[model samples]
Target: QTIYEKLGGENAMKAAVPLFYKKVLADERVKHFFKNTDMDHQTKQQTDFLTMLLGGPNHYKGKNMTEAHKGMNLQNLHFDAIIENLAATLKELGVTDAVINEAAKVIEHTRKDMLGK
Candidate 1:
């Protein structure tokens, strides 16, 4: 079963992640994070990341979520920017508040994994 069928398993991860990355790429503070990252790869990876986390699949073969983010002095300001961009993207995509919260929860869960590395 696909994830969208699971937790109301519905989203335009295509529409969403691309918009999110667009925001990310525009922001100088986090653009470097996407540096050398292929947009095609990024879109697929973020889709897979959400899918796997949402109980749709266990086929994640990406970098260590924690390790990849380690050594980066990702401060709260950076995080706030990311969240703001994400929320804005979600709003633009017409995602419901519930969906946004669900995504925010996932994002929150990854904070330690990403920030503290």
Candidate 2:
């Protein structure tokens, strides 16, 4: 099955994104980055982007991670914190570790692009 299917597909993402962001915004290590963010819009973008990465529907376009994160002075530590929270969020939602690992791989692939590393 596609990673997205294993992840409970679009339904999972629709549920996950907001919860994920909730944890992210609560975490001191990463909360600051989202202070001024348009959460409703960002949540949809995140859901669409990650769904595409997981082989689900491509519901949006031209959302550049690098450009979006530009001027944020993001570093590996920030990325690490964000990804860590993501993995934790997945796990919290009863997603298996194998699936989380696969999703982690997708996030990992975007690391350099996102951090401008």
Candidate 3:
């Protein structure tokens, strides 16, 4: 099964995304990036994004990593906040530490793709 399938797949992802975003939207760090955007669409897009990333499916067709943040000049600290929020969200949901580490490893793999726009 795909990593997403092991992690409870679409239904679980749909549930998690909004809860995570609620917290993200409240924080000043990433909130500005999400300002006035349709939260529902983003919530769903994240599910698709993660699913595709984890070899679940090819339904994800979001912007290229570089183009997505073009001109934003997103530094490592900004990326760290996003990752930290994700870790906190997993903790809030009572996910295992191993799962959290696995997620972080996935993030580590993507860091190069996300840098130096």
Candidate 4:
């Protein structure tokens, strides 16, 4: 099974996305970036993106990672904060470490494009 299936598939992604956003919005390091974001839309888009990323359905139609994050001036610290929040969200949902690590590695692939590096 893919990481998506292993992580409990759609149900897990639905749960994790909101919880993950809560942590990101509350985080001092990354909260400012989302100050004006439409969270409802962002939440939905994120769910789609992550669902695709984890090898689930491919409904994500958002901008490419580079285009989406362009001009954001994001750095390693911001990315790390997001990753930490994601890991925390999965952990809180009782996902095993091995699965979380796999998810993280997959996410890590977007860092360069996400950072515009």
Pairs clashing in candidate 2? Answer: none
lDDT of each: 0.72, 0.86, 0.74, 0.95
TM-score for each predicted model, relative to the true structure: 0.77, 0.94, 0.86, 0.97
**Deviation from native of the Cα of residue 27 in model 1, angstroms:** 1.9
Q: Report the C-alpha lDDT of model 4 over 1-117, residue by residue, as the tens digit.
A: 999999999999999999999999899999999988899999999999999999999999999998888899789999999999999999999999999999999999999888843
Residue 14 accuracy (lDDT) in model 2: 88
The alpha-carbon lDDT assigned to residue 12 of candidate 1 equals 64
Query: Can you give the lDDT of residue 72 in candidate 2?
Result: 79
Error of 4 at 103 (Å): 0.3
**Model 3 regions more than 4 Å off:** none
Best by lDDT: 4
Off by over 4 Å in 1: 1-11
Residue range 1-117, candidate 3, lDDT tens digits: 665665667776666667778778887777898776787787878878877876667798888777767777777877887888877877787767877677767766766667667
- State which candidate, 1 or 3, has the greater lDDT: 3
Top-TM-score structure, candidate number: 4
Q: Summarize candidate 2's per-residue lDDT along 17-37 as a digit string, tens digits.
A: 888998999998899888788
Give, for candidate 1, the lowest lDDT window spanning 10 residues.
Answer: 1-10
- What TM value does model 1 have? 0.77
